[PDB]
Design a protein around this nucleic acid. Sequence first.
RNA 1: UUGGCACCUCGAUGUCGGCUCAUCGCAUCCUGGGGCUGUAGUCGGUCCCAAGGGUUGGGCUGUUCGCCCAUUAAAGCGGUACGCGAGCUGGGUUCAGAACGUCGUGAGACAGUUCGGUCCCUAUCCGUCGUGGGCGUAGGAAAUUUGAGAGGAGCUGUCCUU
RNA 2: GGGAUAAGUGCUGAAAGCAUCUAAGCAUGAAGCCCCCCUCAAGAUGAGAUUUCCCAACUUCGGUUAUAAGAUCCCUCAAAG
Lengths: 174, 37, 216, 144
Amino acid sequence: SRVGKKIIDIPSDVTVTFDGNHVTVKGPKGELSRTLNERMTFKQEENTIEVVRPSDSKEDRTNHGTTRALLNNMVQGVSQGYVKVLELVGVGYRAQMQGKDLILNVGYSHPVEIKAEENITFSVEKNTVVKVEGISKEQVGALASNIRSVRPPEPYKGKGIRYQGEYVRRKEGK
Amino acid sequence: MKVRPSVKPICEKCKVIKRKGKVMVICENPKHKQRQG
Amino acid sequence: TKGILGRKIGMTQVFGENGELIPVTVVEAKENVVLQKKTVEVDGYNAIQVGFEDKKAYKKDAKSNKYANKPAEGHAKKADAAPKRFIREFRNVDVDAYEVGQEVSVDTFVAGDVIDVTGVSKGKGFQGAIKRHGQSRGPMSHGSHFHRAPGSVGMASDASRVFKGQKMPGRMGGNTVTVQNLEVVQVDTENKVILVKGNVPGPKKGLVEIRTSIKK
Amino acid sequence: MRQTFMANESNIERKWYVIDAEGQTLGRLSSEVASILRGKNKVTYTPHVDTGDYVIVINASKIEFTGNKETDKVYYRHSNHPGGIKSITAGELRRTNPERLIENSIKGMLPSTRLGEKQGKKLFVYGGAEHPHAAQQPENYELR
RNA sequence: UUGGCACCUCGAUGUCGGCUCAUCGCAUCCUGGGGCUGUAGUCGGUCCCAAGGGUUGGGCUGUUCGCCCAUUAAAGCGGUACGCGAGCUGGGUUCAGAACGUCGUGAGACAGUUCGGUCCCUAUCCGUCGUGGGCGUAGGAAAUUUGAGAGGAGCUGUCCUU
RNA sequence: GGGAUAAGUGCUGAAAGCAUCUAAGCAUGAAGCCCCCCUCAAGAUGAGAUUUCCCAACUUCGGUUAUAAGAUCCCUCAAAG
Ligand SMILES: [Mg+2]
Ligand SMILES: [Mg+2]
Ligand SMILES: [Mg+2]
Ligand SMILES: [Mg+2]
Ligand SMILES: [Mg+2]
Ligand SMILES: [Mg+2]
Ligand SMILES: [Mg+2]
Ligand SMILES: [Mg+2]
Ligand SMILES: [Mg+2]
Ligand SMILES: [Mg+2]
Ligand SMILES: [Zn+2]
């Protein structure tokens, strides 16, 4: 696992604490705690961390790559955070913020409201762009997916909620 | 989705994968999406 | 959530605000008292036990259910109440809202309350499959020797038996029935009468249990 | 000459044992308990009498399965009514009624006889670590 | 399904269709959830999941079918002795009468037709539906109950608004 | 309405520096499943719970006894049959 072999460089500000299998990572933006694979062994240096796999068995190899990535994501997340941007397309499609919660109008009789989650921030620009910001890459990804799911992009005109950098296949209706 | 005993790449982009013990083909082209069954 | 015990008196009609004819059932729910409060601690569940309709006190050589037996008299006395003909538990109500020996009034319910009425349906005795299970008759003419019979009760060698739940002649009625989403048209405090819109199960003089509707 | 000893109620002594189900495979625990209940571990074992000992199983909720049994092992029961087949998974049974899971497992390893039913009644199973049979003064038993 | 075979039944395992009562499978007719589309929308096509419930009345014919009229969300396909005659019918078929065509010298004959033509049984056991008595449930009782289980229910249209 | 799911749809994610819904992990998802609703139900021989009622003399000291609370016979009946 080349991914597993690659060391994670701890930012000077960020501090990583390992308790048994569980690891708690503290950074300026937030603190993230997760449980890594038991078999994997972690070597910690002041400026870097190395994950070590006990055996070359597939199971150990698979977990090694995953474990490294999970730890890397936590460290990066606390340091810089992760943000996903979604852009509404089509006339009359607008996004607005009701306190923490986000309100979406997407060609439905009912307005759609997405509640904010802990360690997540919802921000809207121009009422056509929504950005989800959080320490956890997964949490940002999940909420972005939920927002995108409210109205997925249509093929013919591209109308819908889409990721900013997403590509949509286009078809000619008539 | 195409459900068939013979699941194979239709184009160069098609990728054979296994999900939940099932041979499947994933592709940018939706038509080439396949699941063995 | 509220509950009361009453006797069905009969049916009548009331004219609504817009002059619509409202079929109603008159229930008399006098003499309701909370005999006991069941708790999770002692009983494993919370309920109020309500005794309805006073019965005569214990006598030495009582030959009928009109006079309270010594066990019954004691149970009622613990609530400081007269012995009761009918006793039922209400699990729907909040136990805290009630105290033992408290009278439960008809005024607990108010007009427009949606209620479920529970009672034992009228007995019909031994009844055939047509009336009991609403089956079709056989032909009355054209050579038919099949009129009110139940029909085939099975198949052949595969199953060589009748399945459980085959519909056959038997005793019909006298079953507990709950009619849901009925409405309290009116409450008469003076006569201790609750007017329930529509009809409820059982003969006149039958026991009815009125509860706040489970579905809301 | 006929000299074989025969155990009878007068000479039979039944003991009480506690077995912890925590970290034990269901079947392997089950097979061992079945032998204890049937008196197979006694030198005075006699077929037509119950020479077995009472068994208390604790922490039934913590019994373990191998492979995908939790979802793929299904218990089927019929009500004797047409189409009356009802199924719950072993995993769900463990969550909801762990005592039944253990009890049915052991009873299925006991003979379907009047004696076998009696021997199954000597089994007491509890999902938690606490049992109410302290008066019986049960002895801890370690599975071989 | 049409057959092949001739293994249980010839000291009898009643046979078509309908009626009554169903019950099960899912290769799903409708309704629910999806993928792909040569999917603009409205509609469709095709495939996957799904058996919870639902799945109409007539004309003709003994009919099963099938065609037709009018509907319906839909008018599903199969198994259960082509389910069910000690539950019903008895129109067809499969006795004795008679006739036509036809064949036969004839007596007669015909998966050709035509008309007429006896459907028995007081339920012992299991099974099923109801309804009591005994004993048990470590004293004898009266009331009120928990719910391990088990059964039931489970369908859809149209219109208005957006 | 709730919980868990199907076909699906994903998020994060390596084996496999990419990619990938899956392997670890995390979501979402049917008239279906388990409930929610209705009815029966402790012969549930695993026979459960609560409240109340009854509680003495004899005796060979083994136990018996009619009586208690209670319930029936019999009788007048119906909302029951
Ligand atoms: Mg091909
Ligand atoms: Mg009819
Ligand atoms: Mg007649
Ligand atoms: Mg031969
Ligand atoms: Mg014979
Ligand atoms: Mg299928
Ligand atoms: Mg037949
Ligand atoms: Mg027959
Ligand atoms: Mg005939
Ligand atoms: Mg012939
Ligand atoms: Zn392709």
